[model samples]
Target: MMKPEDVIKEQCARAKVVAELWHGFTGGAPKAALENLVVEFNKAQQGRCVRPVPQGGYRDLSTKIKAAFAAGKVPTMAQAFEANIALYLEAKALLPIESLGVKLQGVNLTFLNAVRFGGVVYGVPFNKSIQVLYYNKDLLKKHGVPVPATLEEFVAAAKKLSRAEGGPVYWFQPDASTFAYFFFNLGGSYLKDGKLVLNSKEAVEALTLLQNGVKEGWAKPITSGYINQNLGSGPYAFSVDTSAGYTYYLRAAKFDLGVATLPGRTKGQPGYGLVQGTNLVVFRQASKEEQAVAKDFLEFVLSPRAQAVFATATGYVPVTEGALKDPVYQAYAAENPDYATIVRQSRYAKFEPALAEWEQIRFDILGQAIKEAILNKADPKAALDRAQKLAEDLLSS
Candidate 1:
């Protein structure tokens, strides 16, 4: 019954070389993958032991890290997003991994770029993933809808399927990230010339589609939790969510699960799914010896063997090219074709705005805009315009 901080402190005091990792993998496949890796790391190495402490999801972990920083009790290392890393850098709380003499020779540069700030690598990619479309095969077949290849087809299929018994054919949980997927596919940019531009025509069009979906009653906005369960047991026939939840959906679903790329704007066009995941960062509070121990654990996780194990256990993409070539991963991919689809679609992935204020804009402004447009029935253009003005004001100040 010990508190998380107490457990970490006690482990640090007891072990010769102890490095604590604060991560957001609190449950399910992700949690299992990370915890097993930590166990393996602890057992494989003598003298050095890495302890992983789960601190809830990304937002919860970020809040706890900031609070711990203010209390001068930050862990040796923790998972962070680009915006969180920026805040930590401003507070002088992060230790650049390269400064500790750690070399990430084989890591994927695309994933690495997300953690780099000002020419220095501040973190290492941990669980990189992309959004995907999940559909109920039986339901789609029953409605005579082929897998939607384009946004227009997806809408058409949704409307057709909604006519069936107990139907609300599609459900997309609205968030800044989900909305960004549609916006990016529609060729909209969140930031243009260092200013918020979500009030543009493309943005309005993207929001309007979502609002129209809800208004038409063929598609609905997910207002609460248990989305996987709802998509499994409820009226939803199709859903758009992170590919990382592939295994969870497979386990929860009663019908055959169908995985596909996010529908494109038009036939033969490629859709862009947002690349999302956490990165591991060392804290300045740790001593050189502690930082070195942490670097070892970081290097271990980025290794081909560990990456394969992680990618297979969770639905995330491995961080190294070698992992893809690894026999273990190759065999796993052959068995689980859904993961292969995710890997294929990953080439079309897009990143969010890397600005420090993005966290605020994402949750406060863009999130509010979506809620107002969908739930409150506000005009999509007007709602986005207000959000754009607020974001612009915040960025200027």
Candidate 2:
């Protein structure tokens, strides 16, 4: 058997195949192994083969990828997130990643589930993350409110903070994406029996919570960009964003930041902090040897040391439990107890439905329908009903 490192080094030496990696929204640090692979590949290939495309926005990169495929310029491999797997699968353009799976010993089963749709594994989780509730300790202290546990308590705390003297109009602000988190945390299912079921009772309950919060003025129904500014300015008492933001919050802002798992409405309900990162996907363009090298590089990444480095640098949960428990991550968590809050919440971390056509169905049709619900132009049920119908039609056709 070839030594894993030797296999990686060999792949790095291959010159004909170009591996184009995609980074999702807020793409940050690459895994240590991936970084090393890039370095070695560049060194060996002399800038001809290995390329890392930092396509910043998730939607934009995904669109560019599809366009590239249409134009016949698809890369050998690309980074894809679980949510975007549906798109690749729908197009029938993805190379199977079962080889990578054999090497992914000890990776989280939950993480695997995120990338699996309809019994087919679409992608590998490279930067698995779960959202946590982050707040300014100073602001919470100033307002004399405890960390919220239940949604009611969370709401009350938001109200108190929002009513602070000379504070911004709202106490808490989360983007529309956060609403989906609320649904998942509440144990809602986006699909049932492989069919879209967005208008279910659980979805309605989640939507009601979101609408009520907006209508009652507890949370500002605003864009993520605006909410981030407010949080950085110390106006918002609490906000739920990606785990990727933890590093930014620590480095950029002045206030002492406190992090915790997203508070649940009831016992056993996992406040699904959303999983928001991309995966490394293999493409069919690569030769068998190149694919073997890709698989080897992926395995090297899942190594305990590599995972620890990734978790430490990127604040993303490691794909494997051993990586999560590695000394590097342990030290980071020991210094910042808040990091473990996310780990504790992993059991309840619900991944979005892994539909093969999720990007178009969700972003185009369902996303627009949700917007309609928010605007009150249509009833939530009617809006979701239309979304489900459109999505079903598209998938069937």
Candidate 3:
């Protein structure tokens, strides 16, 4: 496997163009933005331009990029994580940007702190965002449920508002991955003492809360089209989701929605939020000159105009201080206070560790355990125990 610096240095040997992955913002056609960015960047330098390739799926393309690097067919640059940096370090495929005198501190410190693993920074975070609890203010008022400040209050309110009469058909509904909300809500950490800790007492308790919500008819199983199909058709009043969904709800829902910080069991518990977004990484295909140009382009992305456009066009939080201070941000905040709640809650948000295996671990074990528990297929304790064992085996190997 390649380590950090080896990967960076290896990317310094070819042309500089980012291999674009199809995502929400890219929508499989991200080239126009790149073409526009290149036009602007080339103004500063005569011969340099950034290109975007319409690659396949992000996960599949990432796998191909890794295989190519191992086989010496690598691109000059590719995006990898701080944990994955160890792979490049092992393969001697990365170049240390620090050696090139890059100072990353000027970026959004809150987000930078989340992506760093073991004191080494690997990929650049182009999108910094957070998850929050979105509810209908009118619904809470109708149910007379105070906006919950802690877990007890949250559960109580959810139960009170979940009944079939006078209330929505479902109290709350979130995607399966939302189990992370429970883990953090209960003051649980994913890893403890360098070991996987998914099956702990706290994990079970968190799972139980969701199960209770379902049993009491307060929450429903996550279906593929549930979010879109039920947007304004309220038989449901609240959900946990990423900040990007705020815009979607605003446009689709007729009720006055309220955005609130994620709840905790008590004060001093981290807000139990997760950073949900993507990053920009360079592959190992470019030449040294190309690497320099990529670095310059990365820095150019930090400019206020670039950051403002990024945040406006997409719901991602900007990764620079300048963008936070921009008048556009100020006006947006004034118009939509919920957007600011995302930023405020982010101060206490956490990021998953940067391990590649975490993809399966998170989706299969942690995420599925929550679903199984809530669906009554298994009790919370058994679900968490199985999940913990699975996690142990996965991480141990």
The TM-score-based order of candidates, best leading, equals 1, 2, 3
| Model 3 lowest lDDT segment of ten | 20-29
List, residue by residue over 134-220, the lDDT tens digit for candidate 2. 787787888688877766677788877777744443333333356677777667777778677767877767666666666666666
Give the top-scoring candidate (TM-score): 1
The digit string of per-residue lDDT tens for model 1 on 183-210 reads 8988898767866687998889888988
lDDT of 3 by residue, 243-282 (tens): 7666666766777878888777775543667777665555
Give the TM-scores of the predictions, in the order they appear: 0.94, 0.83, 0.81
Which candidate gets the maximum lDDT versus the true structure? Answer: 1
Q: What is candidate 2's CA lDDT for residue 295? A: 71
* Model 3 alpha-carbon drift over 4 Å, by segment: 1-47, 54-61, 67-93, 164-176, 226-229, 232-234, 267-270
Report every candidate's CA lDDT. 0.83, 0.67, 0.63
Give me the runs in candidate 2 sitting further than 4 Å from their true place. 1-18, 25-37, 40-49, 100-102, 117-120, 166-176, 224-226, 230-234, 267-270, 373-379
| C-alpha lDDT of residue 387 in model 2 | 75
Candidate with the larger lDDT of 2 and 3: 2
